[PDB]
């Protein structure tokens, strides 16, 4: 079988997420691309647990914890987004370059 | 069942259980009672942070053990770092309670975030697993995102939180990608001292996928330590965050990340020492060169201290680079112990000066000696200790760091460290040069209307526990190392 | 196998709306007109296109829901292993439920769950 | 056969039992159910209506076939109208003026 | 209490065996095993049976009883992370057919289970009847499960 | 314990194409709503990948938690942005995107030159003893429950503390 292709897709996702992390002109989109990167990492973890850890399932547990951390980040922001929009009424992150 | 196996293992993390209990009790009292009192919050934060050290010192002589089924390692190396984290939190609580109260904001949430970041920093010090080397710094990084934007109204803090959240989501996901690469090409092993064996068992110790894991882990850790081009998150966050939280993230973040870097480069990555040695050498040389050069062109005190921190981290990196043979890890501590006092004093003086004055620009520090000679003296002593000036802690710390570097044959690293230390005098002397201006025309009206007031305040005690340390530890640099070469 | 039926059922369930759309396309007539394609606004001509922009204090329960979903997801494997193990997992998940209750109390008292 | 299945019945008996179940379910019971719905439509209480609807809900796959092939249209008042063009013998024996719920019994439907 | 726990007999004449399981239990599909029954509420409390092809005519063709029982317990019946011990080994013989019934405990670092396993060889097949209960509730149910392991019978297909 | 071979490979290719389409929609859409809806396709495809491998519990957890996350994300993107803006529609291309496209292509090439050069099937035959399941634990979710409850106790309470503090910080920061 061609299970290794999954790894390839994960790598692609990582790079794509990385790309979407940089060219983001909207911090909500940057958060979504952070979710994309964590999802690629989770894909790697799950397929490695399938490959080598059929008994202990350490990769699946690590995937669950990474999902928990990603949801915690998704709860912390957009609350940070809420504070930013309440104070500045704008979301575009490249336009804020006061600290430089 | 028995609830015993976990009960005997639960006593090993009792200093952290004290922090958890204090956190829960503080939260419950905040929720239950409408009124808010500063002294009770002071008492609960202090008694949470002075009972963890009381329990930790009682656990010093105990045998090293790996508990929670290969999840928490207690030995001599991590106990010192946990004590350092607790000391940072203990000396940062007085820095925070006055500052956040003067901003008219809720303070129980700030103390909760600080206590949680301390709890997540103590767990990172001994984290003998790959899941808890991810979860514990996410107990720290998420609180650091909640902090440094707790101001919630300044237009600087929102941008600082944006930059911190985005750059620390960029890191700590590269780190976990490296963790996934290391876990996959090892045979499904995540315990720290069990994946080099797993690598040999799968015969992938020379695989190209191991180099990816090493690079990703080093990048994700050098983001948190902030040497070299992983440094850009530091100054903006340091320039646009409240001073107590940034002092905490200056001392607490480097201790936990240094412990994680030492326990992730020596235990699971000793077979490929010739690669991460080069990575750390580049990461340190670039750090000193580009943290001491930019600091001399700074007009803001917090940003200058940021470049200062990313410069002093490169001196500590030499301790990892030399290794445990020629002292090494015994020179990481006995300098990080110095660095904590140096930075916390030089941030306490900034806290008091900003609170009584209302500014951060360096040009408004002129003529502070005429107004408050004690504060100017203390800030000058802290900055001169930062520059490695002779009778103060930084000088002996740097010569200890350089003795092991020379003993290991790293002439280039020691030479760059000495040249950057020479560069690191012009700043830490520029501020003093401002502090000793008697010209009334060059004195900003910010310090002209300065009231010292006839009360002591808490930060004065907190930095009097510090300024007398950075100067009078200079004889006591024989008592400290015999506690740091004893670990191995 | 217990999961090939899952894949076949998912494929059929996805195919069914495609079949409905194809049957409607080949059966129903098309009689499009510029008045017909206008957005319905109770007779009157719609003003600016939609959009409401709720207040934050209304939609602050979602941040609670994100955390509570993770907590209820984490509670399931403990319940699956409650019988094989003993009171150890009871003590383990008691702290989880207590932290959930404390967070709910905090959200209640701080006014996050108020509309 | 294969490991995992044990003591399975013979296929002819399973087929016979399934055939008699389908015979009772598809062409025997839906006629009785729809007749019990047509007759006694106005004599229901809450319990009888609940059980009628329950039986319709259970046996609807068998009722969906018989329904296109059945009509329940109401019959003329006189039982002499063979054709729509037929005339009543005497137009007085019919019962005109059926009442409704406020002032009628079950005899007026 | 009244008469003891009532048991139901499961006879597979197509596969040529017959055993006896508590009537409170329910049938269910064990992964790849021929027959299985389990308690409706409690976990790790079940009877299972799967057979493998063989050319031997009896269990005595497998070699010495204790040695082959130990090698089966260490190598086949236990995962590498499970520490095993055998507490009782018995041989019974009816109608010229011998059954080897042994009780063993598998103590993983996570959980501990106890099993009565009866081996038989007949009809060109090797039968591995297994009764399992959690260790915490083993002492209560051991006799109530031993009647199962003593009830295993193999006949001609 | 798997699907038929050709069916498994075809499902891998199809779900990979769907995942690529969803990720490209995420990183090419101006509207946060449209890119969020593409993210939902990515989430569904990744959950199907988890179901494909062996993860029937991780897939459900991914679906539940990440569906809540995307619903919250759509709500807060509606609430924190300008008008509906269907006209935005694939934001413009700059040089600053062109250089990062090259950098990310180089990074992806570096990763794929390692993935395509490592014999991942060779590692599987070396980790034989890691794939011998306990025969009593038929249910995979039962194994994941046992190994979450016993093997990982410290992260299990650390994540509880993390979730509580994250909830408190989200309430405190976002309040008006
Ligand atoms: C100038 C300052 C230092 C003056 C010279 C140092 C020698 C002092 C006396 C001689 C001696 O051996 O002292 C030895 C001292 C004692 O310092 C430490 O004391 C410990 C007692 O628990 C143990 O004896 C240690 O081995 C010893 O090093 O070493 C120093 O570090 C000297 C400074 C002590 C701190 C003063 C503040
Ligand atoms: C203190 C923290 C919470 C309590 C932890 C475990 C409870 C202590 C008793 C455990 C014994 C048990 O199984 O529960 C008994 C019932 O006891 C209780 O329900 C008492 C607890 C009351 C309330 C606790 C739960 C809510 C908190 C049933 O009796 P038994 O004879 O079946 O068990 C004996 C043997 O120890 C089994 O291992
Ligand atoms: C190094 C130690 C750093 C922590 C202690 C800094 C000094 C604190 C101090 O001097 O006491 C202050 C804190 O005093 C308290 O009220 C709290 C009690 C003492 C807390 C600090 C010490 C605690 C540790 C003592 C030893 C351990 C005791 C518990 C274990 C037995 C004074 O507060 P106040 O009453 O002036 O505050 C007025 C308020 O701001 C008006 O809004
Ligand atoms: C073991 C439990 C130990 C609890 C110690 C708490 C304590 O000493 O009581 C405090 C709290 O006592 C009270 O008066 C509140 C009622 C009890 C609240 C605690 C309940 C949950 C405990 C867990 C003291 O109040 P204070 O004068 O310092 O002001 C705190 C106040 O709530 C806010 O200003
Ligand atoms: C701001 C810090 C300045 C530096 C302070 C230096 C102190 C002087 C030098 C002390 C050297 C002797 C200590 C060497 C290790 C002793 C190990 C030991 O047995 O410690 C016991 C005592 O614990 C301590 O006091 C340890 C604290 C000192 C070591 C750590 C200091 C802080 C870290 C420095 C950086 C254990 O506690 P217990 O109550 O379980 O033991 C009972 C009895 O004393 C022995 O059986
Ligand atoms: C001999 C070397 C003496 C000078 C170096 C030194 O110890 O540091 C300071 C000397 O420190 C003192 O002024 C003495 C008080 C603190 C004691 C520090 C150690 C003194 C020397 C110890 C032996 C050497 C120098 O800066 P300053 O504090 O004089 O700066 C001016 C100040 O703001 C005026 O108030
Ligand atoms: C189930 C998945 C269905 C397949 C989705 C992709 C369909 C094929 C690609 C077409 C592109 C597309 O759908 O894009 C739309 C955006 O796509 C989506 O948002 C659909 C994907 C969300 C799937 C949700 C899964 C959960 C709108 O952008 P456009 O440039 O095509 O619009 C042209 C014009 O404005 C008329 O609309």
Swiss-Prot record, chain A:
This is NAD(P)H-quinone oxidoreductase subunit 4L, chloroplastic. It catalyses: a plastoquinone + NADH + (n+1) H(+)(in) = a plastoquinol + NAD(+) + n H(+)(out); a plastoquinone + NADPH + (n+1) H(+)(in) = a plastoquinol + NADP(+) + n H(+)(out). GO terms for molecular function: oxidoreductase activity, acting on NAD(P)H, quinone or similar compound as acceptor; quinone binding. It is an enzyme of class 7 (translocase). GO terms for biological process: ATP synthesis coupled electron transport; photosynthesis, light reaction. Belongs to the complex I subunit 4L family. NDH shuttles electrons from NAD(P)H:plastoquinone, via FMN and iron-sulfur (Fe-S) centers, to quinones in the photosynthetic chain and possibly in a chloroplast respiratory chain. The immediate electron acceptor for the enzyme in this species is believed to be plastoquinone. Couples the redox reaction to proton translocation, and thus conserves the redox energy in a proton gradient. It is found in: Plastid, Chloroplast thylakoid membrane. Keywords: Chloroplast, Membrane, NAD, NADP, Plastid, Plastoquinone, Quinone, Thylakoid, Translocase, Transmembrane, Transmembrane helix, Transport. One of its GO terms (cellular component) is chloroplast thylakoid membrane. The chain crosses the membrane at residues 2-22, 32-52, 61-81. It is a multi-pass membrane protein. NDH is composed of at least 16 different subunits, 5 of which are encoded in the nucleus. NCBIfam families: PRK05715.1-2, PRK05715.1-4, PRK05715.1-5. It comes from the Eukaryota. Its main location: plastid. The gene is ndhE. Its EC number is 7.1.1.-. Gene3D superfamilies: 1.10.287.3510.
UniProtKB/Swiss-Prot annotation, chain B:
The chain crosses the membrane at residues 5-25, 38-58, 80-100, 105-125, 130-150, 164-184, 208-228, 276-296, 304-324, 335-355, 376-396, 399-419, 465-485. Its EC number is 7.1.1.-. Pfam families: Ndh2_N, Proton_antipo_M. It is a multi-pass membrane protein. It catalyses: a plastoquinone + NADH + (n+1) H(+)(in) = a plastoquinol + NAD(+) + n H(+)(out); a plastoquinone + NADPH + (n+1) H(+)(in) = a plastoquinol + NADP(+) + n H(+)(out). Keywords: Chloroplast, Membrane, NAD, NADP, Plastid, Plastoquinone, Quinone, Thylakoid, Translocase, Transmembrane, Transmembrane helix, Transport. GO terms for molecular function: NADH dehydrogenase (ubiquinone) activity; quinone binding. It comes from the Eukaryota. It is found in: Plastid, Chloroplast thylakoid membrane. GO terms for biological process: ATP synthesis coupled electron transport; photosynthesis, light reaction. GO terms for cellular component: chloroplast thylakoid membrane. Belongs to the complex I subunit 2 family. PANTHER family: NADH DEHYDROGENASE. NDH shuttles electrons from NAD(P)H:plastoquinone, via FMN and iron-sulfur (Fe-S) centers, to quinones in the photosynthetic chain and possibly in a chloroplast respiratory chain. The immediate electron acceptor for the enzyme in this species is believed to be plastoquinone. Couples the redox reaction to proton translocation, and thus conserves the redox energy in a proton gradient. NCBIfam families: NDH_I_N (TIGR01770), PRK02504.1 (NF002701). NDH is composed of at least 16 different subunits, 5 of which are encoded in the nucleus.
From Swiss-Prot, chain C:
It catalyses: a plastoquinone + NADH + (n+1) H(+)(in) = a plastoquinol + NAD(+) + n H(+)(out); a plastoquinone + NADPH + (n+1) H(+)(in) = a plastoquinol + NADP(+) + n H(+)(out). GO terms for cellular component: chloroplast thylakoid membrane; NADH dehydrogenase complex. Its main location: plastid. It is found in: Plastid, Chloroplast thylakoid membrane. GO terms for molecular function: NADH dehydrogenase (ubiquinone) activity; quinone binding. Pfam families: Oxidored_q4. This is NAD(P)H-quinone oxidoreductase subunit 3, chloroplastic. Belongs to the complex I subunit 3 family. It is an enzyme of class 7 (translocase). The keyword Transferase does not apply. It comes from Spinacia oleracea (Spinach). It comes from the Eukaryota. The keyword Transferase does not apply. It is a multi-pass membrane protein. The chain crosses the membrane at residues 5-25, 60-80, 84-104. One of its GO terms (biological process) is photosynthesis, light reaction. PANTHER family: NADH-UBIQUINONE OXIDOREDUCTASE CHAIN 3 (PTHR11058:SF9). NDH shuttles electrons from NAD(P)H:plastoquinone, via FMN and iron-sulfur (Fe-S) centers, to quinones in the photosynthetic chain and possibly in a chloroplast respiratory chain. The immediate electron acceptor for the enzyme in this species is believed to be plastoquinone. Couples the redox reaction to proton translocation, and thus conserves the redox energy in a proton gradient. Gene3D superfamilies: NADH:ubiquinone/plastoquinone oxidoreductase, chain 3. Keywords: Chloroplast, Membrane, NAD, NADP, Plastid, Plastoquinone, Quinone, Thylakoid, Translocase, Transmembrane, Transmembrane helix, Transport. Its EC number is 7.1.1.-.
Swiss-Prot record, chain F:
Its EC number is 7.1.1.-. Keywords: Chloroplast, Membrane, NAD, NADP, Plastid, Plastoquinone, Quinone, Thylakoid, Translocase, Transmembrane, Transmembrane helix, Transport. Its main location: plastid. The chain crosses the membrane at residues 10-30, 33-53, 63-83, 105-125, 152-172. One of its GO terms (cellular component) is chloroplast thylakoid membrane. It is an enzyme of class 7 (translocase). It is found in: Plastid, Chloroplast thylakoid membrane. Pfam families: Oxidored_q3. It is a multi-pass membrane protein. It catalyses: a plastoquinone + NADH + (n+1) H(+)(in) = a plastoquinol + NAD(+) + n H(+)(out); a plastoquinone + NADPH + (n+1) H(+)(in) = a plastoquinol + NADP(+) + n H(+)(out). The keyword Secreted does not apply. One of its GO terms (molecular function) is quinone binding. InterPro entries: NAD(P)H-Q_Oxidoreduct_6 (IPR050290), NADH_UbQ/plastoQ_OxRdtase_su6 (IPR001457), Nuo/plastoQ_OxRdtase_6_NuoJ (IPR042106). PANTHER family: NAD(P)H-QUINONE OXIDOREDUCTASE SUBUNIT 6, CHLOROPLASTIC (PTHR48479:SF1). NDH is composed of at least 16 different subunits, 5 of which are encoded in the nucleus. Belongs to the complex I subunit 6 family. NDH shuttles electrons from NAD(P)H:plastoquinone, via FMN and iron-sulfur (Fe-S) centers, to quinones in the photosynthetic chain and possibly in a chloroplast respiratory chain. The immediate electron acceptor for the enzyme in this species is believed to be plastoquinone. Couples the redox reaction to proton translocation, and thus conserves the redox energy in a proton gradient. This is NAD(P)H-quinone oxidoreductase subunit 6, chloroplastic. The gene is ndhG.
